[PDB]
C-alpha cells in the first residue's frame, strides 16, 4: 500500500495515476488537504501538520510506502513563511516519525535545487556542495534532506530523496512556484498572446519534463539498496535554459507570439539558485536517465497545450 | 534589557555574570527550565519549547536582545533525538518568531562544529563549506543558522551566530557531553586518579577556553550590524588537540596521571567532525581574537580546579 501526501499538486496530480498504473489502483491512496479528481483512486483528507491524522491514515490502510509531496513551494513560502515552516518542517518530521513508529518500509521525498544559495557554484553543481538556502522553502527542504538521512542512519528507516529542478508539465497548472513561467509561456504561445515573464531574460535554470520527473522518483523508490550511497539529495536535471532561450525556441514553432520582461520577487529567488546541475551520482547509483530532451518536451507541450485550449480539436 | 535562555548551562553559568559586569546588573535577565545560582541577577523559569512563555517574558521585561543558549547537545541528542528536535528546532523557531513579532532587536545564537559532517574537509575548514550533519543536534543547529540568516534577510531581525568548537571551563560542571572529556580529564588529574576517556586517543578536535568563548560571543554581539557579511556560521577556535595530546601535556604538570581509552558512541559523533577550523572570517569581520593558548588554559584549569 502506497500513500501519497500532497496529491493535488503539480506532481501529485500525475504521480497518483502513474503509481496506480504501475502497482494497481487498489494499492495507492491519494491524500491532500484539498481534494481533486483522482481518476477512481481512493482519496483521503490528510493534513501532514497533524500527526494524529497521519497515524490514523497509516494504521487504517496498512501503509508500506509514502511519497511525501505535501508542502509549500518557494514563491508561496515567501508570501507566508510561517505556513511554509509549519507544513514543510513539522509536516515532514511528522511523516518521518509516523513512518518509523509504524512499519512503513520506505519514505520518498522530493527535494529541490531550492536547497542551494548564492555561495553554491553556478555550473554543473554536484550533490555534495554548499547548501545555504535563502528562502524559507529552501531552509525547510535542506532540513528535510538532513532529517531523512538521519532517520535512516539512526533508526534504519529507508528514506530517500532527489533534488528536482523546475518541472514542466501540462496536466496540472502550477501556481505557487518560481519556475512556473516555463509552463505559463506555452499557454500564451498557443494563444498567440504576449507573455509577461517575471524572470530576467537571462535567468538560467535547470529544468526537466514531467514524464522524466515521474520516472526518476519511482526509479529512486525502486532502487536497489546496495547501491544507494548518497541516498538523500541526488541532483537530477535534463537541461538548462533562460527565458529568452525558451521563448526563442518556442518561436521556431509559433512565430506569432511575443514576450516582455517584468521581473518580480521570484526573479530574486531564482537568482540565488544554480544554473545547471551534475546528475552523475543519480545515474551511477540508481540508473537515473532522461528520455525527453528540450526539443522533445517543447513540441510535446505545444501538442497537449493546443488540445487543452481547443486550438486543435478533439 | 538582555534575556539569556538556557542560563544554567556551561556557557550561561558564566555568561550571565559576564554580561552583568559589562552592561549593568539591572539590564540582564537569566532564564532556564532548571534554576541555579545567578548571584543576585534576576532569574525566571522559561521553557523555550513553549512559544507563549517566550512572548510573555519578552513583553513583561521589555527584552531588547536575546542570547539564545537553550538546547540539547550532541550526546544527549543521540540518546533522545525527539527531545533535541523539540527543544532545539521548535525552541529556536519560537525564539525567532517571538523576537520578530514582539519588538526584540538582537538575537545571538551559539552554533557548533556539530553542523559539519563526514564530507566536510578536516583541516582549516572555512565557514562556507559542506554542512551535512549526522546528529539530530547538528541537524537542528544548521537549521538554526539558516533560519537566523533568513530572519535577518527577510524581516531585518538582527540574528548573529558563531560556531563554537569544544569549550573547556571550570565554573560549570561537565555534563557528559561529547567534548566534555576535555573538562573531566582535569578533575581526575588533580585527584591523581586514572581517567577513562570515551574519545579515541587520536580523535583530533578544535577547542577553546571559556574566557575566549565568552569574549567572542560578546564581541560578535557588539559588532556593528552593517559590517557583518557572513553574519551567521562564523567558525571560531583557539587550538586543535587529541585526547592523548592533552593527556601528555597535563602529565608534564602532574606526572602521576594515568589514562585509558574506552571509546563509545560519543567517539562516533566526534569522528564526523573536522579536526581544525579556519577562523579568519570572524577575525576580519568582528575582531575575533584568542588570549589563551593551550599551555595557558591547561595551567589555568589545573590552578582553578585545584584551589577548588
Ligand atoms: N513542481 C516542481 O517543479 C518541484 C520541484 C522540486 C521539488 N518539488 C516538491 O514536490 C512537492 C510537491 O510539488 P508540487 O509542484 O506538486 O506542489 P503544488 O504547489 O502543486 O501542490 C502542493 C500540495 O500541497 C498541499 N498541502 C499544503 N499543505 C498541506 C498539508 N498540511 N497536508 C497535505 N497537503 C498539503 C496543497 O494543498 C497542494 O495540493 C513539494 O514538496 C515540492 O517542494 C516540486
Ligand atoms: N558548551 C559548548 O562547548 C558548546 C559548543 C558549541 C555550541 N554550544 C551551544 O551553546 C548552547 C548552550 O551550551 P552549554 O554548554 O551552556 O549547554 P548546557 O548543556 O550546559 O546547558 C543547556 C541548558 O539548556 C537547558 N534547557 C533544556 N531544555 C530547555 C528548554 N526547553 N527551555 C530552556 N532551557 C532548556 C538545560 O536545562 C541547560 O541549562 C547550546 O545552544 C549549544 O548548542 C555549546
Ligand atoms: C526548483 C523549483 C521548485 O522548487 C519549484 N518548482 C519552485 O518553483 O519552487
Ligand atoms: C562542538 C561541541 C559542542 O557541540 C558541545 N560541547 C557538544 O559536546 O556537543
XYZ file of N, CA, C and O in Angstrom, chain B residues 67-211:
580
model
N 20.239 36.248 24.076
C 21.365 35.339 23.892
C 20.658 34.002 24.089
O 20.327 33.621 25.211
N 20.391 33.318 22.982
C 19.668 32.052 22.999
C 20.606 30.869 23.178
O 21.173 30.367 22.212
N 20.760 30.429 24.425
C 21.654 29.317 24.743
C 20.916 28.007 25.017
O 21.534 26.950 25.095
N 19.600 28.070 25.170
C 18.829 26.867 25.459
C 18.964 25.796 24.378
O 18.930 26.090 23.181
N 19.119 24.546 24.802
C 19.237 23.476 23.831
C 19.810 22.177 24.350
O 20.401 22.123 25.429
N 19.607 21.124 23.566
C 20.110 19.790 23.874
C 21.353 19.636 23.001
O 21.321 19.989 21.824
N 22.444 19.126 23.573
C 23.691 18.975 22.822
C 23.828 17.639 22.085
O 22.921 16.815 22.101
N 24.974 17.427 21.446
C 25.186 16.218 20.652
C 24.941 14.870 21.314
O 24.168 14.058 20.797
N 25.583 14.626 22.452
C 25.435 13.346 23.136
C 24.003 13.060 23.590
O 23.447 12.009 23.275
N 23.405 13.992 24.326
C 22.034 13.806 24.794
C 21.085 13.716 23.603
O 20.069 13.021 23.651
N 21.425 14.432 22.538
C 20.604 14.417 21.347
C 20.509 13.034 20.739
O 19.461 12.646 20.223
N 21.602 12.280 20.787
C 21.574 10.940 20.227
C 20.843 9.964 21.133
O 20.307 8.964 20.665
N 20.802 10.264 22.426
C 20.088 9.400 23.355
C 18.586 9.658 23.272
O 17.782 8.751 23.508
N 18.215 10.890 22.923
C 16.807 11.287 22.817
C 16.609 12.328 21.703
O 16.405 13.514 21.970
N 16.664 11.887 20.435
C 16.500 12.762 19.268
C 15.226 13.603 19.291
O 15.242 14.777 18.917
N 14.124 12.998 19.727
C 12.849 13.702 19.788
C 12.932 14.912 20.713
O 12.352 15.960 20.430
N 13.641 14.765 21.827
C 13.798 15.863 22.771
C 14.652 16.958 22.143
O 14.354 18.146 22.275
N 15.713 16.554 21.453
C 16.593 17.517 20.806
C 15.837 18.311 19.749
O 16.037 19.517 19.605
N 14.964 17.641 19.007
C 14.204 18.320 17.969
C 13.220 19.304 18.585
O 13.140 20.461 18.170
N 12.481 18.837 19.583
C 11.502 19.673 20.271
C 12.157 20.923 20.849
O 11.731 22.042 20.575
N 13.202 20.732 21.644
C 13.898 21.848 22.266
C 14.699 22.724 21.302
O 14.590 23.950 21.335
N 15.498 22.094 20.447
C 16.332 22.835 19.509
C 15.590 23.411 18.310
O 15.680 24.608 18.040
N 14.863 22.570 17.583
C 14.150 23.045 16.398
C 12.968 23.932 16.785
O 12.931 25.105 16.423
N 12.013 23.378 17.528
C 10.849 24.152 17.950
C 11.258 25.363 18.782
O 10.762 26.467 18.565
N 12.162 25.145 19.736
C 12.614 26.220 20.605
C 13.228 27.411 19.897
O 12.919 28.563 20.207
N 14.116 27.142 18.948
C 14.759 28.217 18.209
C 13.762 28.918 17.290
O 13.782 30.145 17.160
N 12.880 28.149 16.657
C 11.882 28.758 15.788
C 11.036 29.707 16.633
O 10.779 30.839 16.233
N 10.614 29.234 17.805
C 9.804 30.037 18.722
C 10.531 31.328 19.095
O 9.938 32.403 19.102
N 11.817 31.219 19.416
C 12.606 32.389 19.787
C 12.642 33.413 18.656
O 12.407 34.604 18.872
N 12.922 32.946 17.445
C 12.986 33.833 16.291
C 11.646 34.491 15.980
O 11.573 35.699 15.746
N 10.585 33.695 15.975
C 9.256 34.211 15.682
C 8.822 35.209 16.761
O 8.289 36.276 16.451
N 9.069 34.874 18.026
C 8.710 35.759 19.133
C 9.508 37.058 19.054
O 8.973 38.144 19.274
N 10.791 36.942 18.730
C 11.656 38.106 18.617
C 11.241 38.967 17.430
O 11.331 40.193 17.480
N 10.791 38.321 16.361
C 10.376 39.046 15.171
C 9.123 39.873 15.439
O 9.112 41.085 15.223
N 8.069 39.217 15.915
C 6.824 39.909 16.208
C 7.054 40.964 17.280
O 7.071 42.163 16.986
N 7.236 40.519 18.521
C 7.491 41.441 19.618
C 8.715 42.248 19.213
O 9.522 41.795 18.406
N 8.851 43.442 19.769
C 9.947 44.332 19.418
C 11.362 43.966 19.914
O 12.076 44.792 20.477
N 11.772 42.718 19.693
C 13.121 42.302 20.080
C 14.038 42.890 19.010
O 13.655 42.967 17.847
N 15.244 43.293 19.400
C 16.176 43.935 18.478
C 17.445 43.173 18.081
O 18.008 43.418 17.011
N 17.899 42.258 18.929
C 19.099 41.480 18.625
C 18.995 40.066 19.179
O 18.446 39.854 20.257
N 19.515 39.099 18.427
C 19.490 37.701 18.847
C 20.825 37.042 18.512
O 21.250 37.033 17.358
N 21.495 36.510 19.531
C 22.777 35.842 19.333
C 22.579 34.362 19.641
O 22.045 34.005 20.694
N 22.995 33.508 18.711
C 22.850 32.068 18.876
C 24.185 31.349 18.766
O 24.908 31.500 17.781
N 24.539 30.566 19.791
C 25.806 29.843 19.735
C 25.640 28.601 18.867
O 24.928 27.663 19.241
N 26.262 28.602 17.692
C 26.170 27.439 16.838
C 27.285 26.476 17.220
O 27.924 26.638 18.265
N 27.557 25.503 16.364
C 28.516 24.469 16.723
C 29.211 23.799 15.543
O 28.715 23.836 14.418
N 30.359 23.176 15.805
C 31.059 22.450 14.756
C 30.207 21.217 14.447
O 30.483 20.467 13.514
N 29.162 21.021 15.249
C 28.261 19.904 15.035
C 27.462 20.028 13.747
O 26.791 19.081 13.344
N 27.517 21.188 13.095
C 26.796 21.364 11.836
C 27.571 20.725 10.685
O 27.087 20.661 9.555
N 28.781 20.255 10.974
C 29.609 19.623 9.949
C 29.404 18.115 9.950
O 28.893 17.559 10.912
N 29.816 17.464 8.863
C 29.673 16.023 8.751
C 30.892 15.419 8.077
O 31.863 16.130 7.813
N 30.874 14.108 7.789
C 31.995 13.407 7.154
C 32.554 14.042 5.880
O 33.753 13.961 5.625
N 31.687 14.666 5.080
C 32.123 15.286 3.830
C 32.843 16.614 4.017
O 33.499 17.104 3.095
N 32.716 17.203 5.199
C 33.358 18.484 5.478
C 34.867 18.280 5.600
O 35.323 17.370 6.291
N 35.661 19.109 4.908
C 37.116 18.968 4.985
C 37.549 18.925 6.447
O 36.957 19.594 7.287
N 38.580 18.144 6.749
C 39.040 18.002 8.129
C 39.996 19.066 8.642
O 40.092 19.277 9.850
N 40.702 19.742 7.741
C 41.684 20.731 8.176
C 41.458 22.157 7.702
O 41.190 22.396 6.522
N 41.588 23.098 8.633
C 41.424 24.519 8.343
C 40.173 24.788 7.515
O 40.228 25.425 6.462
N 39.042 24.312 8.014
C 37.772 24.479 7.325
C 37.252 25.906 7.400
O 37.166 26.487 8.480
N 36.906 26.495 6.244
C 36.383 27.864 6.217
C 34.916 27.811 6.654
O 34.352 26.725 6.773
N 34.301 28.967 6.888
C 32.909 28.991 7.335
C 31.926 28.555 6.256
O 30.919 27.914 6.553
N 32.211 28.903 5.006
C 31.345 28.491 3.903
C 31.909 27.158 3.418
O 32.952 27.108 2.757
N 31.222 26.069 3.751
C 31.702 24.742 3.378
C 30.545 23.747 3.368
O 29.382 24.136 3.456
N 30.867 22.464 3.256
C 29.847 21.424 3.252
C 29.287 21.279 4.666
O 30.045 21.155 5.624
N 27.963 21.291 4.797
C 27.338 21.152 6.110
C 26.252 20.086 6.055
O 25.080 20.396 5.864
N 26.652 18.827 6.212
C 25.709 17.711 6.190
C 25.845 16.954 7.511
O 26.365 15.836 7.559
N 25.368 17.561 8.611
C 25.434 16.952 9.945
C 24.774 15.580 10.024
O 23.784 15.320 9.340
N 25.316 14.713 10.875
C 24.791 13.363 11.021
C 24.184 13.087 12.390
O 23.839 11.940 12.696
N 24.063 14.128 13.212
C 23.454 14.003 14.542
C 22.199 14.879 14.556
O 22.119 15.844 13.807
N 21.208 14.541 15.386
C 19.999 15.369 15.440
C 20.400 16.782 15.877
O 19.910 17.775 15.349
N 21.310 16.861 16.840
C 21.809 18.138 17.332
C 22.339 18.975 16.161
O 21.961 20.138 15.986
N 23.212 18.374 15.358
C 23.777 19.082 14.219
C 22.727 19.523 13.219
O 22.805 20.616 12.657
N 21.732 18.673 12.994
C 20.669 18.997 12.054
C 19.896 20.209 12.554
O 19.613 21.131 11.793
N 19.568 20.220 13.841
C 18.815 21.340 14.386
C 19.627 22.622 14.380
O 19.078 23.711 14.229
N 20.942 22.491 14.534
C 21.798 23.666 14.559
C 22.051 24.299 13.200
O 22.123 25.528 13.099
N 22.199 23.489 12.155
C 22.411 24.082 10.840
C 21.095 24.767 10.457
O 21.094 25.836 9.852
N 19.970 24.174 10.851
C 18.671 24.780 10.569
C 18.591 26.121 11.309
O 18.062 27.104 10.782
N 19.132 26.163 12.526
C 19.127 27.382 13.328
C 19.893 28.498 12.616
O 19.427 29.631 12.556
N 21.070 28.174 12.084
C 21.882 29.156 11.367
C 21.163 29.691 10.134
O 21.235 30.884 9.825
N 20.493 28.796 9.417
C 19.783 29.166 8.198
C 18.543 30.002 8.485
O 18.264 30.977 7.771
N 17.806 29.635 9.530
C 16.612 30.385 9.896
C 17.046 31.763 10.382
O 16.407 32.769 10.081
N 18.142 31.797 11.133
C 18.650 33.058 11.637
C 18.973 34.010 10.507
O 18.567 35.171 10.525
N 19.705 33.518 9.514
C 20.075 34.345 8.376
C 18.810 34.740 7.622
O 18.681 35.870 7.161
N 17.866 33.812 7.515
C 16.626 34.109 6.815
C 15.880 35.253 7.493
O 15.449 36.199 6.834
N 15.725 35.176 8.811
C 15.012 36.229 9.518
C 15.679 37.583 9.341
O 15.001 38.609 9.309
N 17.002 37.589 9.215
C 17.709 38.844 9.014
C 17.431 39.396 7.619
O 17.085 40.566 7.464
N 17.582 38.550 6.606
C 17.368 38.988 5.230
C 15.912 39.299 4.912
O 15.621 40.232 4.159
N 15.002 38.536 5.510
C 13.569 38.693 5.282
C 12.880 39.776 6.113
O 12.189 40.631 5.561
N 13.074 39.735 7.430
C 12.429 40.687 8.341
C 13.339 41.740 8.968
O 12.866 42.623 9.686
N 14.637 41.647 8.706
C 15.569 42.602 9.274
C 15.893 42.328 10.734
O 16.450 43.185 11.419
N 15.536 41.144 11.224
C 15.839 40.794 12.612
C 17.343 40.559 12.687
O 17.892 39.758 11.936
N 18.002 41.262 13.599
C 19.449 41.167 13.754
C 19.898 39.878 14.441
O 20.234 39.889 15.625
N 19.910 38.774 13.697
C 20.324 37.486 14.244
C 21.772 37.198 13.848
O 22.128 37.273 12.672
N 22.606 36.880 14.837
C 24.016 36.592 14.596
C 24.379 35.275 15.271
O 23.771 34.908 16.273
N 25.364 34.570 14.728
C 25.769 33.296 15.308
C 27.185 32.877 14.939
O 27.676 33.180 13.856
N 27.846 32.189 15.864
C 29.189 31.686 15.627
C 29.175 30.206 15.967
O 28.320 29.743 16.726
N 30.107 29.468 15.384
C 30.206 28.034 15.611
C 31.292 27.716 16.624
O 32.475 27.788 16.313
N 30.891 27.359 17.834
C 31.868 27.023 18.852
C 32.407 25.611 18.681
O 31.708 24.714 18.208
N 33.676 25.405 19.056
C 34.305 24.087 18.970
C 34.028 23.568 20.384
O 33.104 24.045 21.036
N 34.809 22.613 20.874
C 34.575 22.164 22.233
C 35.021 23.278 23.168
O 36.025 23.942 22.899
N 34.289 23.514 24.252
C 34.680 24.567 25.185
C 35.132 23.994 26.524
O 34.435 23.183 27.137
N 36.310 24.429 26.961
C 36.893 23.994 28.228
C 36.566 25.063 29.272
O 36.723 26.251 29.011
N 36.084 24.639 30.439
C 35.743 25.563 31.517
C 35.787 24.838 32.859
O 35.823 23.604 32.902
N 35.774 25.601 33.950
C 35.821 25.016 35.284
C 34.690 25.470 36.209
O 34.409 24.816 37.211
N 34.038 26.582 35.881
C 32.967 27.086 36.737
C 31.700 26.246 36.708
O 31.027 26.092 37.729
N 31.370 25.700 35.544
C 30.191 24.850 35.421
C 30.666 23.401 35.324
O 31.666 23.108 34.669
N 29.951 22.499 35.985
C 30.306 21.085 35.974
C 29.995 20.468 34.616
O 28.971 20.771 34.012
N 30.881 19.589 34.116
C 30.645 18.954 32.816
C 29.370 18.120 32.852
O 28.906 17.730 33.925
N 28.802 17.846 31.682
C 27.566 17.077 31.616
C 27.621 15.901 30.648
O 26.675 15.653 29.896
N 28.742 15.185 30.681
C 28.968 14.004 29.850
C 28.849 14.256 28.352
O 28.600 13.330 27.582
N 29.038 15.507 27.947
C 28.956 15.853 26.542
C 30.101 15.269 25.735
O 31.134 14.888 26.280
N 29.919 15.206 24.424
C 30.935 14.659 23.535
C 32.325 15.260 23.761
O 33.318 14.534 23.790
N 32.406 16.577 23.933
C 33.704 17.214 24.138
C 34.041 17.455 25.609
O 35.107 17.994 25.922
N 33.148 17.055 26.512
C 33.379 17.273 27.937
C 34.532 16.470 28.541
O 34.926 16.715 29.682
N 35.076 15.514 27.795
C 36.192 14.732 28.315
C 37.334 15.703 28.599
O 38.163 15.464 29.480
N 37.360 16.804 27.844
C 38.411 17.814 27.971
C 38.298 18.610 29.260
O 39.192 19.391 29.604
N 37.187 18.423 29.965
C 36.977 19.091 31.237
C 37.132 18.045 32.338
O 37.855 18.268 33.312
N 36.473 16.898 32.166
C 36.544 15.809 33.148
C 37.986 15.401 33.425
O 38.364 15.150 34.570
N 38.778 15.308 32.362
C 40.166 14.890 32.474
C 40.936 15.662 33.539
O 41.750 15.084 34.261
N 40.660 16.958 33.659
C 41.332 17.786 34.653
C 40.949 17.416 36.079
O 41.790 17.446 36.973
N 39.682 17.076 36.298
C 39.239 16.699 37.635
C 39.951 15.429 38.097
O 40.341 15.313 39.260
N 40.123 14.481 37.182
C 40.817 13.247 37.522
C 42.307 13.493 37.735
O 42.915 12.911 38.635
N 42.894 14.366 36.923
C 44.324 14.655 37.044
C 44.677 15.271 38.394
O 45.617 14.834 39.059
N 43.924 16.291 38.791
C 44.165 16.965 40.062
C 44.030 15.984 41.222
O 44.704 16.127 42.244
N 43.172 14.980 41.061
C 42.986 13.979 42.106
C 43.961 12.811 41.936
O 43.958 11.864 42.725
N 44.801 12.894 40.908
C 45.785 11.857 40.616
C 45.125 10.501 40.371
O 45.699 9.449 40.668
N 43.914 10.539 39.824
C 43.158 9.331 39.519
C 43.232 9.002 38.037
O 43.256 9.899 37.196
N 43.265 7.712 37.717
C 43.315 7.287 36.324
C 42.017 7.697 35.643
O 40.929 7.448 36.165
N 42.130 8.323 34.476
C 40.945 8.765 33.748
C 40.534 7.804 32.639
O 41.379 7.277 31.921
N 39.228 7.568 32.517
C 38.699 6.697 31.475
C 38.087 7.607 30.415
O 37.013 8.178 30.609
N 38.796 7.740 29.298
C 38.394 8.607 28.200
C 37.522 7.895 27.170
O 37.869 6.811 26.692
N 36.396 8.516 26.824
C 35.468 7.936 25.864
C 35.695 8.321 24.405
O 34.956 7.884 23.523
N 36.708 9.145 24.151
C 37.061 9.516 22.779
C 38.371 8.800 22.470
O 39.169 8.543 23.372
N 38.592 8.473 21.201
C 39.811 7.776 20.807
C 41.058 8.594 21.135
O 41.029 9.821 21.119
N 42.180 7.919 21.420
C 43.406 8.656 21.743
C 43.849 9.669 20.685
O 44.470 10.680 21.001
N 43.515 9.405 19.426
C 43.914 10.298 18.345
C 42.750 11.064 17.717
O 42.842 11.508 16.574
N 41.662 11.230 18.463
C 40.499 11.955 17.954
C 40.769 13.454 18.066
O 40.523 14.056 19.110
N 41.275 14.055 16.990
C 41.594 15.483 16.991
C 40.363 16.359 16.791
O 39.559 16.106 15.892
N 40.232 17.391 17.620
C 39.103 18.317 17.541
C 39.506 19.738 17.888
O 40.482 19.957 18.604
N 38.758 20.729 17.381
C 39.067 22.125 17.682
C 38.487 22.394 19.070
O 37.441 21.842 19.437
N 39.178 23.221 19.846
C 38.753 23.552 21.200
C 39.112 24.996 21.529
O 39.840 25.653 20.787
N 38.592 25.488 22.647
C 38.884 26.841 23.103
C 38.484 26.971 24.563
O 37.612 26.244 25.043
N 39.146 27.888 25.264
C 38.908 28.122 26.680
C 37.758 29.112 26.871
O 37.623 30.063 26.106
N 36.941 28.886 27.899
C 35.771 29.726 28.170
C 35.976 31.243 28.143
O 35.130 31.964 27.620
N 37.076 31.754 28.723
C 37.277 33.206 28.692
C 37.241 33.749 27.266
O 36.682 34.818 27.014
